[PDB]
């Protein structure tokens, strides 16, 4: 069991945790209870692993897609906010955190990938994936490249795979059917085949990850990248003149990225459910709290209505939502963890030439 009289929080390292830590400081000056913020690596996997030993945080921060597994494993406490509080957040954001008819975390913000480009190197970004190979060879003649993004996580390549037919679990009757997986249909094979061709023709590099892609774009070495709102702060300090726009189309169809809702859950083994509930509702989910976190690393479109009216006026926010409107909200069923394991393995194997596209997508067994 975690110690009583203190709140331990887990949040990913790419988010503005220093801003969240400041929000925890205002909490202690009012209540006298310290708040510690940590960013462990692969925290979305360590939480169900360390739960049996009594460790883990009091509050866990992650996108909504992995919270159904935590609930089915019996690791989350059911939240109970009154009707007046639920009216403060958008209705659809509460749906993302509803599992088996119960609320299992507090929604925070909406995330979606966008296209980021260098205005000086590229005044008009391309509208289609198909013209990127021709644009790369023209930029290579100047010592630059067209596009670099994190190929090690299937979150970043899924928009192209799902562009012409790929999907995770079929949704129907208000429920997901785990026996209907759409990872190896004709559209998914076409999307991944196009990605592999870019690497084979030396337009991209199979070993590119998050840090390499972020450094190349921020240092003016590549013209385009794909990332989320949290990455905007690092581009600002590099004074690069950048834009945020819709992703290019593939075979005439738009890219369909998976939309995530950042959420905060409460540990079932925690004796501080009392304080964690008040911290989330009346200190973080306010105009002051969300702004302290957003000004560290942007959160995206927040779930709190009385703040989104301000953030919506940002063109970068409008671009995030237009990609989100063309995509779909991730499922929250427990099988999503096994889904991401199979898809991550298939993309890496195909991108490195160890398997063909037909072999990798057939090998992705999630049911």
């Amino acid at each position: 069991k975690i110690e009583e009289g203190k709140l331990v929080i887990w949040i990913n390292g790419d988010k503005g945790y220093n801003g969240l830590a400041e929000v925890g400081k205002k909490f202690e000056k009012d209540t006298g209870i310290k708040v510690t913020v940590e960013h462990p690596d692969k925290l979305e996997e360590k939480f169900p692993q360390v739960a049996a030993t009594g460790d883990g945080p009091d509050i866990i921060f992650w996108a909504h897609d992995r919270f159904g597994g935590y609930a089915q494993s019996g690791l989350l406490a059911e939240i109970t906010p009154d009707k007046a509080f639920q009216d403060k957040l958008y209705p659809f954001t509460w749906d993302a955190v509803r599992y088996n008819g119960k609320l299992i975390a507090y929604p925070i913000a909406v995330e979606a990938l966008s296209l980021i480009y260098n205005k000086d190197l590229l005044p008009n970004p391309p509208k289609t994936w198909e013209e990127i190979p021709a644009l790369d060879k023209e930029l290579k003649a100047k010592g630059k490249s067209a596009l670099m993004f994190n190929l090690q996580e299937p979150y970043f390549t899924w928009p192209l795979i799902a562009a012409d037919g790929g999907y995770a679990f079929k949704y129907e009757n208000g429920k997901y059917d785990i026996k209907d997986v759409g990872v190896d249909n004709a559209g998914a094979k076409a999307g991944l085949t196009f990605l592999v061709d870019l690497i084979k023709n030396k337009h991209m590099n199979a070993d590119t990850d998050y840090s390499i892609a972020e450094a190349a774009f921020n240092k003016g070495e590549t013209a385009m990248t794909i990332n989320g709102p949290w990455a905007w702060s690092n581009i600002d300090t590099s004074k690069v003149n950048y834009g945020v726009t819709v992703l290019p189309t593939f075979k005439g169809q738009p890219s369909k990225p998976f939309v995530g809702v950042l959420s905060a859950g409460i540990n079932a083994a925690s004796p501080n459910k009392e304080l964690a509930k008040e911290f989330l509702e009346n200190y973080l989910l306010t105009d002051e709290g969300l702004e302290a976190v957003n000004k560290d690393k942007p959160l995206g479109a927040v779930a709190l209505k009385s703040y989104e009216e301000e953030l919506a006026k940002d063109p970068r926010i409008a671009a995030t939502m237009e990609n989100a409107q063309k995509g779909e909200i991730m499922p929250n069923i427990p099988q999503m963890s096994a889904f991401w394991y199979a898809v991550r393995t298939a993309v890496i194997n195909a991108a490195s030439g160890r398997q063909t596209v037909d072999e990798a997508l057939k090998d992705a067994q999630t049911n």
Partner: antibody
Amino acid sequence: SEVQLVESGGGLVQPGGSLRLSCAASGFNIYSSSIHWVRQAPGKGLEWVASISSYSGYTSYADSVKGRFTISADTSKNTAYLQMNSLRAEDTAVYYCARYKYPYWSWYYYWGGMDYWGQGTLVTVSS
Amino acid sequence: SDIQMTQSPSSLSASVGDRVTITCRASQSVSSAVAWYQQKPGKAPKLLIYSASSLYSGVPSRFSGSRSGTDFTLTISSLQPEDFATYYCQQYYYGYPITFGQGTKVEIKR
């Protein structure tokens, strides 16, 4: 070194007899892990028998031992057991107990394999 | 609830310092839920690789795992005297029971 498993309970019995094996753990807690039983006949390969996961209340058995073997765990003394009833001559083998580091859930199957094994105990079923 | 694990070759002879590669094939798709073990005569198995290519702590970096088509592969880049033993593959995808391969013997060549 600090994590180890010590088995006990093997011997020779008649066809139809019973035996009970033990697997005592040190360096970790069985209640927060998974224990497996794997057997090996002289000069052959490995075959999985049974599995238990205390924290998730999960048990599983191989088809060749269903209705005859029973796996259980005593958390208060950090020991797992394998009750073997209706033994046949073809059950003669060395029996191992191995650890899976975390509790078991079907949607979390991908966390790895068996990282620690015991020394084993010999079981002979003959008339 | 049926699956078969087949290893090739069943035996190979090599010298200290050689590079060696063993292959394993499953009769059903199981993603990369395959592990590799080492066993010497009179001793219990020892875990080397899991998730097809993740090296377990303490295993020297001269071991490595990868994929070749649908097959699983295990490679020892610089064979050492302690590396001579029998190697097994094992699948643990939740849709099929835990199943081992028939093993592969690595003997010293003289």
